[PDB]
Amino acid sequence: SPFSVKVGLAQMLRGGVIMDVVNAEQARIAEEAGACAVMALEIRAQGGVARMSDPQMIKEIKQAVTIPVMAKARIGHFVEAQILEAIGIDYIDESEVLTLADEDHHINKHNFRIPFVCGCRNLGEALRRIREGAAMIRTKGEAGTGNIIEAVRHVRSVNGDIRVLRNMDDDEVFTFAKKLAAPYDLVMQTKQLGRLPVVQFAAGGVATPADAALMMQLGCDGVFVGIFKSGDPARRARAIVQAVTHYSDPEMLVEVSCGLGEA
Amino acid sequence: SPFSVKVGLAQMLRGGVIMDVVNAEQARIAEEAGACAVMALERGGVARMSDPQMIKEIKQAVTIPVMAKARIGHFVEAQILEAIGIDYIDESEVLTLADEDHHINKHNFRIPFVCGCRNLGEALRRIREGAAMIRTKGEAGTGNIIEAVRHVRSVNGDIRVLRNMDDDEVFTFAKKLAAPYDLVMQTKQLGRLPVVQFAAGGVATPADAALMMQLGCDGVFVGGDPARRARAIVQAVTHYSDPEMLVEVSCGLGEA
Amino acid sequence: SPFSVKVGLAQMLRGGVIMDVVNAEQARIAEEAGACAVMALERGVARMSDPQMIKEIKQAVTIPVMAKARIGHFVEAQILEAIGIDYIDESEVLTLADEDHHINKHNFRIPFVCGCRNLGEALRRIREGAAMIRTKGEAGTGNIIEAVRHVRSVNGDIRVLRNMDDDEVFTFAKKLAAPYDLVMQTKQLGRLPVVQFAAGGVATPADAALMMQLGCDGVFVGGDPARRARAIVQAVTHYSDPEMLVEVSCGLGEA
Amino acid sequence: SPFSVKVGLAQMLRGGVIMDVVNAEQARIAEEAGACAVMALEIRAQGGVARMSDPQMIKEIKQAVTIPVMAKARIGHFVEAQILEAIGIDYIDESEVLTLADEDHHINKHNFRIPFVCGCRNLGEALRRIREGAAMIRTKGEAGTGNIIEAVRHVRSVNGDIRVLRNMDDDEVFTFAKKLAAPYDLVMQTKQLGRLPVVQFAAGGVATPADAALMMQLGCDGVFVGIFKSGDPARRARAIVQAVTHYSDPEMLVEVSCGLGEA
Amino acid sequence: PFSVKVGLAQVLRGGAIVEVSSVNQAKLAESAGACSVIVSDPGGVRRMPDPVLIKEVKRAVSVPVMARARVGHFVEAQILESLAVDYIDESEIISVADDDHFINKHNFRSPFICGCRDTGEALRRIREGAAMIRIQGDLTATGNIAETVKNVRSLMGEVRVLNNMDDDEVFTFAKKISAPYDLVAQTKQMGRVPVVQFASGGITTPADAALMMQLGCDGVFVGPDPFKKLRSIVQAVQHYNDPHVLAEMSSGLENA
């Protein structure tokens, strides 16, 4: 199925660090430091309404790098998505860090040929996003705080219920799907598989190498990072990348965390 | 019937974009960018009908239909607008409500009225009062379309529910909407709103506008570079199902 | 108009008394006293009456025969119509069958009676097809107090509507939760667009005449039955004649 | 009765616009624009306590114009009233825009030979003021906002109940008087008469010609205006006057509303 | 094999199912034209009926025989499947044995019928493996069809809303009724619940039975002179759109 294909496409991001960038220079630094992909955008401390970014600045970024290029479309704003697909981005992030455009419905992501990333806070929310066509999931903690506490809560939440589900009496799964408010078929598929049937990244407040590695040890396939809001971006970005690749190696983690500068 | 004629007058606005204007300059820029109509207004404080002076100047500066706002329930403001040749009157809640419990009796006028709504029951009540054109209003002056999406979805949603409903249950449904049964059945027959339906509130980008059209709206109201953004939105409404086009007009639009 | 014809079939009752009956005997006694029509029923759950007992009563009298259908039970109605009944009473006195919907009465040829407590309820039943309204009160108590409340409610609202500023009638329709058209028609006429009876607790001649003096086109009624029936009938025919009311009320016997 | 006479006196104000003035010049402009009477006073945006105005400035105004001159006396302050009567004003407005002086009782207006205007918000309040001796009523919305919404509510309220009362079953009027908390005799008098047994003006937030005409179409006999808090007072005052005299003439209303200036 | 059970249950469309407690009652019900009989022995705890009694009923008639198991009592179901019943009704009329889980119905060869009060509940029972749904009103012997009507209308009406729904809104709809999205889609595409739907609870007269049919059900369960009433109800279901027939059958029904 074309869904199996989009899911497959995202497999390549495993062990990767996706980086937010607001221009070319940054996207180059992000690729130079070994980011597996960049996320183009032009919020918390400012306000206003945050929407899809201008195609011009998306086109410029896609030209500056050779790694995949992502872009955010407001939740439910399927036309913002259509525009991003047309522009030829690799992945669309129907992102709750932008201003919600539809409070009751997410974009129907199947209607697209381009793969979608969706946020989640727990297992049910993830399985609902997937059924809607999301090919990749990121468990989002809190955005723009530099505090990782909420990401940890959500990662543990999702992974926790997955372990509960894995060993659950078969006759009790129906009720579990109800309580989760998630499609039973996808729940059983998650049970048999022992994990999310799609790639699962951590996102929100990942500020240091130790943060990134922590997410990996909790069982994530990679992390999103907002790096440029710190002292020296290049070194820090490199450190987080290295941290994800060597997450189970404290010696290396100590190496890359050394003299990082103000976080 | 005089009402069916007013309804017909509003149909010639389908597929169009209506733009707020506060001077003759804007009106031209708006007409230049291909607006189907312009909305005359001079802007906390109490918001009232605009001065006929400036309304007359705008109706003279453009050849497209000119609309103007009257406060909710302010039927005398409406009489004044009608007497000065205005093409449409917008009994608009973005002005300072003048009557909290009654809207203008719009049948008593020759000019076609636009009224706002948040759901189907509200739309039908406005129509029964004489409204010839409905605009599903989100919120005003925020640039956030989330509320418009809610309402458009709410109205279109109930219309779909209505279309397929058991006939014997429509009575109770009309009660729950607190809407006139006749109009409810008429809405069931047509399978849509018996009048033109636009979207208004927070439409800030071409994508916003095309989204409203894709949701079912017959058009939109709009409240960096205006002349450029204006044409982009017009183009968005005309080609709302053409992504390639939507990309082209959104490209390098500027600060919204 | 097929509805206007149904409305007309009901007016022919204007000025009369409708009496509940459970056998040919009672039905005959009621017709003897001068009832303008009889209401057939057998009395837990309360349902449509047996088609047999209804037919027995239909043959044992010359006046129109009414029968109750449970609220929303459109099949009970279909059956009553097929029995050739003159009127169907979609009655809340029986066990409610559909809590959210009434019968679509426009799908029937026979004329329907529906109960109500206020103007909105009345207008809603009419829009559903009811050709006659009985402003209900309290059933089985012999207490007239609730019927008086509802008659005053309906009549009072009608009067308010009669003189209301046109521009305010829309909002008034919303508050009544009633069809705007049927409301403007009621304002134009100055009364309900259909026959309006009172029912609930009407126990004495005085009760009946009171209802008439309050503006009801007639009444339903649920020691000496024959005597009381005639007295009530007379009360309704001569509702503004105190001498009559005194006469037929004298030596009435335990009510 | 001397009450019939005071009521009669107020009949002359029908079709009139009463204007607030704080000095002579204004009172002259108000008369020049065709005001049927002026209201002398020396509030919302400032605070402090608002009382009767100084006689000196009342005497000066009464000398500057030939149309009737009104003045406000605090609610319940019967001595402020005595002073105004002594000064020889035409009408006294026991006015709730001034600082209430008695929270439980209004001035006994019968004890005066000079006619009183009282505010009201609904029918019962109007009939109570009248029984107290008020010869003229003004249904007040809200003061000093320029918003007419509350005046409309009150006008519709009073007129609405009057229509209800007009067609009401006679036997139900007693209860209606109770619910209104208004003297039964005055209620029946209002029933038989089909309107307020005294002159009834609109007041509060009347800012434009359309506002003034609206009040007249709702069934008022005239309006109070606070005009000088706008761009060009003379033109505006003239426009509101003309609006009241031609309230049912949209063409004229358009004429006088044209180029009015900041309201 | 689920499709096989769903296919089997179809043969029941157009029938009345009668609760019997003896081979005597089972025979009458059969002669009266009952499409099937549901065997039971009857406050207190109400359980699966004695396998002996069930065998007598099965032997004493040719029509399909149903029996009740308590909700979640999968062992009681194993027994019923062992004794060779045609259908097992996992029934809330009996005392629930598990308040959090129903029998996993796909573990059995016998077709299951489950009760429901709304669409969500129906779809959940079906995903668990129910091959037939009964829209249940009163669990008591009240003779009142009010709740049955409520639940039948709720079922039908949600199906009709779903039929017309914007596809993009079906996901949220599935979340709201807590039903498996894929069964919701199937229900939408088919414009009807993917299995046979019978009415049950309080059906006391021919008029009651015919009403359920006119409301869109595929048949009915039913719990003085019993034979006469039985045939009348069967006829009522067979001729549910024919008033004259219905009058005939209601005429002289002793007392319900």
Provide an overview of this structure.
This is part of a larger assembly, with four copies of chain A and one copy of chain E (256 residues). Chain A is globular and about 55 Å long. In chain A, helix 9 runs parallel beside helix 10 (233-245) and helix 10 packs antiparallel against helix 11. Chain A has a single domain (1-263), classed as TIM Barrel (Alpha-Beta Barrel). Chain A contains eleven helices and eight strands. Chain A has 263 residues and is of the alpha/beta class. With 256 residues, chain E is an alpha/beta fold. Chain E has one domain (1-256): Alpha-Beta Barrel (TIM Barrel). Helix content of chain E is 44%, strand content 16%. In chain E, strands 1-2-3-4-5-6-7-8 form an eight-stranded parallel barrel, surrounded by eight helices. In chain E, helix 9 packs parallel to helix 10 and helix 10 (226-238) packs antiparallel against helix 11 (243-250). At the C-E interface, helix 3 and helix 4 of C face helix 6, helix 9 and helix 11 of E. Chains A, D: It catalyses: aldehydo-D-ribose 5-phosphate + D-glyceraldehyde 3-phosphate + L-glutamine = pyridoxal 5'-phosphate + L-glutamate + phosphate + 3 H2O + H(+).
As for the CATH topology of chain A, it is TIM Barrel
Biggest sheet strand order of chain E reads 1-2-3-4-5-6-7-8
CATH homologous superfamily grouping of chain E: Aldolase class I
Reported CATH architecture of chain E: Alpha-Beta Barrel
Major sheet of chain A: 8 strands, parallel
Order of helices and strands of chain E: HEHEHEHEEHEHHHEHEHH
Report the portion of residues of chain E in β strands: 15-25%
Tell me the span between the first and last alpha carbons of chain E.
Answer: 41 Å
PDB class: plant protein
Keywords: Vitamin B6, TIM-Barrel, dodecamer, plant protein
Entry title: PDX1.2/PDX1.3 complex
Chains A, B, C, D: Pyridoxal 5'-phosphate synthase subunit PDX1.3
